[model samples]
Target: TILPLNNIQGDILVGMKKQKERFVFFQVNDATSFKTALKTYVPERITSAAILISDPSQQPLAFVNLGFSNTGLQALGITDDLGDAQFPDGQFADAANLGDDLSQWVAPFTGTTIHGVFLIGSDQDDFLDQFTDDISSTFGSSITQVQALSGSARPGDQAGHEHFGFLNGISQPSVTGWETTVFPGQAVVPPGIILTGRDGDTGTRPSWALDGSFMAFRHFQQKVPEFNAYTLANAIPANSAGNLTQQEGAEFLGARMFGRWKSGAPIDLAPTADDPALGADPQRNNNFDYSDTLTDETRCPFGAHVRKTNPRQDLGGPVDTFHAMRSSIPYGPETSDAELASGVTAQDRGLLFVEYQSIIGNGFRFQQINWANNANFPFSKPITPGIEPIIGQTTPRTVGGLDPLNQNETFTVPLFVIPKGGEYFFLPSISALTATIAA
Candidate 1:
């Protein structure tokens, strides 16, 4: 069951490693001409996983992938249910349930005007603009532009690190047949876990939906200063085990909150202190499964961000179906000295969170509701682990086991990450684009 790399979207499997990405949302003015235009345009412009995998060093000037909202699919005369209930109901309908603050959402994502989005990527912003301008000219009167959301990797050495100074894009599960190489500690799942109409996907779908995936796109805003302040104010007391300084204790507190050091080393492996050498090594970083620390939170807290989200062996078995293929990047500028001085976030900056999954409910929605937002998750604990510290949007945001010396100590903290806006889109395979969507 080899994956059809040529059919799958590039960003879904082999992430298009572009410095900048633009998500252009639009509406179809005339479905007839739009479909006609798509027939030729798709094969010529849309980037595929095969393209990048075949030539790893070859970078494209601009890369494009297409996705449609439920309304957009309807406009294209695709009325057959995609098998996912949440896609049709849309993100706005699920916002309240997902603990999203409606007030923080931007204008375009507030309603249902967006029909589809052109995910454009490039090394340069100027080239991206030129590419998108060409896209407008190509579609012309057949489609109307709705909105655009742009994001980029952080600057210089901070490129892979998110706004909170944590190195991200780690620990994604490997697909059994698709991925040729798997890291030491990486979990492996069947293709159907992320691709529609495949072996492990439980959903029944139309023939055209084969190899396609559902994308959960989120505009997450991070309160950088606030997070820094919160961690600093409640620094874990220096313990004799680590002999950490007060400043180092603050770093440790932040690490405990995330379950990984800022360098990307899991606390489960490097318990007492950060091991930069271990963090930088792909073989060692994601290895620990928390089986050793199941009886205690001496190393990593049960409610730690990574621990809550994945929980590897906490449930005593595999949770493969819930794995998500995250392809997110940071947005906005670095925090300025002024913002740090003021101890408040004056400007907008955060992650352009994007994840690909076969079922939105099982992948994105399940994690947010069942694990993150749930205060009493990882159920067997004698003391309630409390809400997930980093991304949990639930009320009475407090977490236990932050201070290793006194594991029972519960600390209340301010919310740092806020869901601004988002949507659920279906990323069709290349074959589906021509055979069904454009036909």
Candidate 2:
């Protein structure tokens, strides 16, 4: 049987758009009432998958909404952790170990606990507003608390770009049957990556997890001003500094850290330049291999963000090994000149890192712990490339391996990006959402 389009959320669609608005983290004061509210909210599910595949020329059928809770909160019996600095509130502020340091980057807030997140999107802002208000009012009394944050993206660019100017949501896994299209780095995982009751599932889940995937949510705060300052200070010379421009050095640095240009070009192929055309071209962007010389860092460095995360060619001993699906969205504001010069971040911004894999330990955790954080990763490289600049950790700040030619030279990198908060979560399917809970 064909997948039920109506059962999925719209953000997964082609044009099934979304306007991200983080709501208060609330605790369920009354489980019975909260469950009842969830049941009522279920009917509001829009034809997410259908709208995505349909012609965008036609007006969207309807907007869709979805929510998630962490395993910690689910077990702690706490409705909300608003105002708790260690736990804080909001999505970006909650992510901690996914990558980067969080303490210095996140902003402080009070009197709000975001127990749930609601995503509402439609052609009409008024309708979205009305729907959001209705959901809030309907569930408000039953929830222990709620706090709200503001953010939205333009149409067409909704999933393509994050709150930051950098293009995001580029890499994702190709699911069996579900994802007909596949990119070079993209892998088709078993249904278990997203849905708990499906092929890859290892947990004893409720019946509701049939078609839903677990949602790995994070709250990341970018130090825009500081990041810009670091880029400017370490601007790569136009002639010697790889293919990045003097003006666009920060952008290039960001790309290196991400292992893909903002345009979506993988660094393995276009190692030097930020080819917007190539980055945007699906045929060429995601294609590449480290098999030429698994030991050669001349091509894609061992520590390159994408390489560290995926390590396709670097790990096979003699060839590339292992593949992963990366689906991340940048959050926060763009870097400003004034902020750049002063080295002070006046605003909050960064990416909301997310991905789905058959095995979290193998996918996200492996990338972070084994590769990104490992100085000797991409073990095939002739020289050990240092930490991944973008997501790499740096307390000592000794160069991990930015300069492939000069293995001895150490580049001192003052920490640029820091993690604020994050958590691992499960995104369940429609069947699980309904039946398992009922069971």
Candidate 3:
């Protein structure tokens, strides 16, 4: 009951370990029938938290987790979409492609046919063939597979690394009363952060809505060609000492974006060269306090992607300011020199930025709207750190400093990741799922 494997989904743990498949995004036509189907289908295959946190050996093959909106459930006539109207539609996508923005990539498929998304992951090519037949037979026309996409983990050493080649999925929140292993500095958030209707929950909901967490689904596509080009243009020579090389610079750029290094190490500490050992080391990697006097961006820029997203100690004071549960996976092909030279994207790749929280205002909203996009974050500093180059967005174009040492120099960033389509959803408790929605 306390472990990640016992409480979370398998993909959130070892990942669905998927290869090729389709992301079936759909809206429930008949709430009663869908609820009935879910009550039977979901519980039968629902993954546990222990399974999610345990080592790979203890994890499963292809796995799935279901998310619903207040409206998503109400569309089943269950509930309405919570938070801002911008997130009314549910977010789901085929976890493939790079640099291709989900906000834009998912546009063409919108309003065409699909309603709910079934992220089909499998090792066998025929898995889709067989599963589609079964789902079509069971749900009939109500649930249909929308767009099919292809994806894969990185190769050999790079496997599990995101588009910028960083090992992600490191710093997740520890539920206060529920989590058994609470790391130092790891905030013990209320259960509401992970489950809706629990502690720290802010949304008003029907009685049955207790214990459900909102799911922010995004179908992101990556553009390997463009990413590589950006890397070359910004590459620092290896001998340049403090400067990051082409590959390392990109890796650093990625760490800044997510607030952690490729090895799952937090940028708050390892502000210089990446230590694969440190990044991979559980005890040393994540252990750091921004309270140290060396907290300034002199080493790591104040607006570094990761720093902007999760300021950690950089913001000063005793309060742990920015924290959220982030689960994202990279999609798309590896970069090739030929693609970089032509300045034309031949392959797609990027990350599926999935997150969960009790309040959208505090969670994803704060990161995107407040920190990443804000020009004046980490108020502790004398000068305001600008937008996070990796995840930051602006209209009419703006420039931000990538090099902390050279504050005057700026990079003209084109919108690399585009938002296509997304929706706010809630992953409700089994009690809510069966008793409330189904009833």
Question: Considering every candidate listed, which one attains the maximal TM-score?
Answer: 1
Question: Native-vs-model 3 lDDT?
Answer: 0.58
Q: By the lDDT metric, which is better: model 2 or model 3?
A: 3
TM-score of each model, in listed order: 0.97, 0.78, 0.81
How high is the CA lDDT of each candidate model? 0.88, 0.53, 0.58
Candidate 1 per-residue C-alpha lDDT over 342-424 given as tens digits, one digit per residue, 9 for 90 to 100: 77999999998888999999898888999999988888887888999888888889889999888999988888899888999
- What TM-score would you give candidate 3 relative to the actual structure? 0.81
**Which number leads on lDDT?**
1
- Runs off by more than 4 Å, candidate 3: 1-22, 50-60, 79-105, 108-115, 119-133, 148-150, 237-261, 264-267, 293-295, 318-322, 396-401
Please provide, for model 3 over 1-439, each residue's C-alpha lDDT reduced to its tens digit, 9 standing for 90 to 100: 2322344443332345454444555657776677667777666545555555567676445455655544455567654444433345433322121122334544424432344455556555476566555556666655544454445566778866776666766666766645467665566566655554555665665555555555565655556567657766765343225655577777666554455667877766676666778777766766775555234453566677666666666655433223567756566777777877786677767666667765665677677777777677766575556666666764422334455455455566666666655556565554555666566
User: How well is each residue in 157-192 modelled by candidate 2, as lDDT tens digits?
Assistant: 434665334565555555554646777655556545
